[PDB]
Design an enzyme around this catalytic site. Structure first.
Site, short mmCIF file in Angstrom:
data_model
loop_
_atom_site.label_atom_id
_atom_site.label_comp_id
_atom_site.label_asym_id
_atom_site.label_seq_id
_atom_site.Cartn_x
_atom_site.Cartn_y
_atom_site.Cartn_z
N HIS A 1 0.85 -1.17 0.00
CA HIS A 1 0.00 0.00 0.00
C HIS A 1 0.88 1.22 0.00
O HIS A 1 2.00 1.20 0.54
CB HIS A 1 -0.87 -0.04 1.25
CG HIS A 1 -1.97 0.99 1.28
ND1 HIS A 1 -1.76 2.25 1.64
CD2 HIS A 1 -3.31 0.88 1.00
CE1 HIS A 1 -2.90 2.92 1.59
NE2 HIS A 1 -3.85 2.09 1.19
N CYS B 1 -4.93 2.51 -3.79
CA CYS B 1 -3.64 3.00 -3.28
C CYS B 1 -2.58 1.94 -3.44
O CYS B 1 -1.83 1.66 -2.51
CB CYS B 1 -3.74 3.43 -1.81
SG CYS B 1 -4.74 4.88 -1.60
C1 LIG Z 1 -6.23 1.22 4.47
C2 LIG Z 1 -4.82 0.66 4.48
C3 LIG Z 1 -3.66 1.48 4.93
C4 LIG Z 1 -3.80 2.93 5.41
O1 LIG Z 1 -4.66 3.09 6.53
P1 LIG Z 1 -5.14 4.57 6.96
O2 LIG Z 1 -6.08 4.28 8.11
O3 LIG Z 1 -5.80 5.15 5.73
O4 LIG Z 1 -3.87 5.30 7.34
C5 LIG Z 1 -2.39 0.91 4.87
N1 LIG Z 1 -2.19 -0.35 4.42
C6 LIG Z 1 -3.16 -1.19 4.00
C7 LIG Z 1 -2.81 -2.58 3.52
C8 LIG Z 1 -4.56 -0.72 3.99
O5 LIG Z 1 -5.57 -1.52 3.56
#
Ligand SMILES: *Cc1c(COP(=O)(O)O)cnc(C)c1O
Ligand SMILES: *Cc1c(COP(=O)(O)O)cnc(C)c1O
Lengths: 401, 144, 401, 148
Positions: free
Chosen positions: A119, A358
């Site tokens: 991510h 993302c």
């Molecule tokens: C959603 C997600 C994030 C980021 O989380 P936030 O709460 O938006 O900071 C990071 N890594 C993975 C694998 C995710 O699914």
């Protein structure tokens, strides 16, 4: 012995009726009444020592807040609750490690190995610190099974390797790499491992002692909890080694114009008034979640995903990117744009997500610019799967050729 | 170029969309309308604004003739949004900046009975395009 | 907002019956039903495409979220809503400016002027960045009236002065320095001004254009709003000049292993999933607050503080640190430890705060190690003042020898 | 052995406290008597403060230190700025003091506050220094494995 009942589980979520067929839990999870009720009570009462009428309720909220760390520890099988730090989310948690651990240690030429399945949260901070220190980000590619190629890791590790950024579970494929082996290789090379558990915490919460994880991060909103709250777990030695994060109240011990001293971890890393609502609400989520066997609840979620995949596979032009029979189902249809499908599925009462998730490098590696993603939670049913499958057919007939 | 505003008019769209009451058929016809918008080459994409959304990528650009009439061009990856863009282009092409600021392009979606479809795709690119036209119409006075 | 009615105002806060006599609003403010109700609705519904039953409520929440920036801008008379950035809190807001604006610009020997009346949040970050860049923190002392000595500022400014960290309103004295003049002096020397408005936003919200403020920060919880949410205002040129803050999703435009590009402000400075609950709840607070004339509401709050001070001043051994007849009343009693007093006042039903108030240098200047603080909000009454005065008498009789 | 000393555990016992606090039902009077009890704890000089742990809270500063005799009996000393906490510390010192580490880990000192009927008061001042002192005693009792 604690037989998981999906209906019982379902009953707890007041959002579910209005939500229709909700298959976007990997983005954000729905909340049980326990979380909704703790939040309303927190904002409906004074945070002072005087309570004229609703003492019992006030004592309950205090109890929740004070135990919050312990409850996160129990989820991760962490040895001590002082190893838990509050953040605003996985993204902040990872940035903290980059800046407070990595930045003061990295020298020009040093290397940060990051998987292509990461991510953006577990990639952009490393790019940023790399630029700041003169270090370099090295890619750990996918194997034939679309997981980070952990067996290749010894060959990518050089004497200049320092950090391993690796996700416990992809938000696209739902795939979990062989994390135990990965960590063994990294530790042999004297590296430290940052594990992104934003998805993993929800489905396969990591035993941090058994796995020997250095750092672990997740977000409260994916864990059936409030927004604006996240966790960073770290080994106490590492939290001690970290520089202070933000400067301000609570984190300081003594301050003058000549300088300042700080508290110990975790308070060292927690400046300012904490998001008390988030902590209390997350505590409510965890206490509640502790009643169910996650292994059984996850099995259920996966069962539904499997039925979904097998059914959709009968339609021609179908392709799945799903790994290890996970509860996350990324997919697409030949010649059909994912944005169009999402719009039409919405209209049929099915709520899901399209786009890049993302995860640009991963999709580039998979040779696509975006995908549809259906993610199954334990509050979903078989009727939900049928409704999805039926909706797709109707959508395809409008869009095809 | 593209046929919208010249060979495909508000009248011609109205003949097509007016008799449609079922929402499924309205979308089908939007998708079909979008096929009439050509793909747009890389060189013309360079001179257009790229509005890259999370959901869907969309392009929009303009030129002005000596008449004062504005020519609009653009593209979408999403096929429903491509149909909606085709409707939007019918409304605003060959019209001057004074004419444009004086009538809302959204009025055409009402006449065609497409407010529900427009609404459903607003954040998939339609917001961006509409506001990009308003920004483009404000530049065309000559200077600020 | 035709004539301010304290009773009407009072009626909106469900915490007030149970809260007893609440005089700790400068720590954290009680919440009106509008905020409590928006939060419950947000957590009670899906955030997806599909809404089967409660579409109206879902439209309302979306409306609130999208307008949230504009509503903050209206409060600050900001020119455009893109100058508003979401943070956790004032503490994060200030740290951002220190790290994203100051750190890449400060050279060894450069100078940061900070007032002795500053909250730790507007001091520790400057100490941190000073150490990191080789810059130095220079103190701006108090005058005879216990306000930062703005007339001394030209003397303290040298050719190496770059930043002026200054509070709009002290959380101890309630005193506001001559901010307009301060800024004129700073700008003449080509300096940039960081204004901590955590208190000021609540009592005398700053007109950022008129005052020509460079940066301005406050917290949502002091502003009758949710925890875990704060604001950073900046001039657009300055926000454009800032480096990215946290790295991750949303803030990035394009990402590869070779590097990344970012969005423009404010999204450049907002990585990860935002605290959506906080933004919505803060929006609900601002929309609601917009109904009342703050000038009248603050006058009321001050009237009560004045009655409190004059009454307590009749008791011997009393000392007040209160400036400009503010709604904040810091005080103590000769020979009586402040911790003892707070405990007993609690027992009499008066909710108060003691301690250092994250303001050690100020209290050292004032020659004390801690103080009691009663802070008055527009939901307080004259009965509250009488109850305070009466409780102090009872307390003093138990504690005085 | 000692300097300013203190009477708790020796001259002032659980019995002595019980005679004083047992007949008190009104909460105001209980606090009065705690404050008065705290006057019997001497002002600890700067030199003895140097060898004690300083637990500086936001609310209130508190000191706690220990010495162990050849007997194996532990002597405790400390101070508080807050007078209500000073009384509670005095009660705490009565429960410990002159007791060995084995004895200490096997008894809960909190039992004395129940016997005196002071739980409400203890509870109200926990975060003003009592938590800290109590845990500092537990930390000090754990250090008496070493030197064998
Ligand atoms: C959603 C997600 C994030 C980021 O989380 P936030 O709460 O938006 O900071 C990071 N890594 C993975 C694998 C995710 O699914
Ligand atoms: C409370 C306060 C802060 C810090 O706000 P947080 O929300 O705790 O980050 C900063 N400055 C002043 C003057 C305050 O009163």
């Amino acid at each position: 012995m604690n037989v998981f009942n999906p209906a019982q589980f379902r009953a707890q979520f007041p959002a579910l009726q209005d939500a229709g067929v909700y298959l976007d839990s990997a983005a954000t999870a729905l909340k049980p009444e326990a979380v909704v009720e703790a939040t309303q009570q927190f904002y409906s009462l004074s945070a002072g020592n005087v309570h004229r009428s609703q003492f019992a309720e006030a004592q309950r909220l205090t109890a929740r807040y004070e135990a919050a760390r312990e409850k996160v520890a129990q989820l991760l099988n962490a040895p001590d609750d002082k190893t838990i730090v509050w953040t605003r989310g996985t993204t902040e948690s990872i940035n903290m490690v980059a800046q407070c651990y990595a930045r003061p240690r990295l020298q020009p030429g040093d290397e940060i190995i990051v998987s292509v399945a990461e991510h953006h949260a577990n990639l952009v901070p490393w790019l940023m610190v790399a630029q700041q220190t003169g270090a370099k980000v090295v890619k750990l590619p996918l194997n034939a099974q679309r997981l980070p190629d952990v067996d290749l890791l010894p060959e990518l590790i050089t004497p200049r390797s320092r950090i391993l950024a690796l996700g416990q579970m992809s938000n696209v494929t739902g795939g979990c790499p062989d994390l135990a082996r990965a960590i063994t290789f990294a530790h042999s090379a004297g590296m430290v491992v940052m594990v992104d558990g934003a998805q993993g915490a929800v489905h396969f919460p990591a035993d941090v002692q058994q796995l020997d994880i250095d750092f672990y991060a997740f977000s409260g909103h994916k864990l059936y909890g409030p927004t604006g709250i996240g966790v960073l777990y770290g080994k106490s030695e590492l939290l001690e080694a970290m520089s202070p994060w933000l400067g301000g109240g609570k984190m300081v011990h003594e301050v003058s114009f000549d300088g300042f001293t700080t508290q110990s971890a975790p308070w060292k890393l927690e400046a300012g008034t904490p998001n008390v609502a988030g902590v209390i609400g997350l505590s409510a989520a965890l206490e509640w979640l502790a009643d169910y066997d996650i292994n059984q609840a996850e099995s259920w979620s996966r069962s539904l995903a499997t039925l979904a995949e097998d059914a959709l596979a009968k339609r021609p032009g179908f392709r799945s990117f799903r790994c290890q029979d996970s509860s996350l189902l990324a997919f697409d249809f030949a010649g059909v744009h994912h944005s169009d499908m999402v719009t039409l599925l919405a209209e049929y009462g099915i709520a899901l997500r399209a786009g890049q998730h993302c995860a640009q490098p991963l999709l580039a590696e998979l040779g696509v610019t975006g995908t549809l993603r259906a993610s199954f939670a334990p509050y979903n049913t078989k009727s939900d799967v049928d409704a999805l499958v039926n909706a797709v057919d109707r959508a395809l007939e409008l869009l095809v050729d | 170029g593209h046929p919208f505003g010249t060979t495909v008019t508000a009248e011609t769209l109205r003949n097509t969309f007016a008799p449609l009451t079922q929402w499924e058929d309205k979308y089908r016809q939007l998708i079909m309308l979008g096929k009439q918008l050509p793909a747009l080459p890389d060189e013309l994409k360079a001179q257009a604004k790229e509005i890259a959304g999370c959901e869907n990528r969309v392009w929009l650009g303009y030129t002005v003739a000596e008449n004062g009439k504005m020519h609009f061009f653009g593209d979408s990856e999403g096929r429903i949004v491509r149909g909606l863009l085709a409707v939007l282009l019918t409304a605003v092409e060959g019209k001057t900046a004074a004419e444009l600021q004086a009538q809302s392009p959204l009025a055409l979606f009402d006449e065609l009975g497409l407010r529900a479809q427009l609404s459903a795709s607003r954040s998939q690119g339609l917001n961006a395009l509409s506001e990009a036209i308003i920004a483009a119409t404000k530049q065309v006075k000559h200077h600020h």
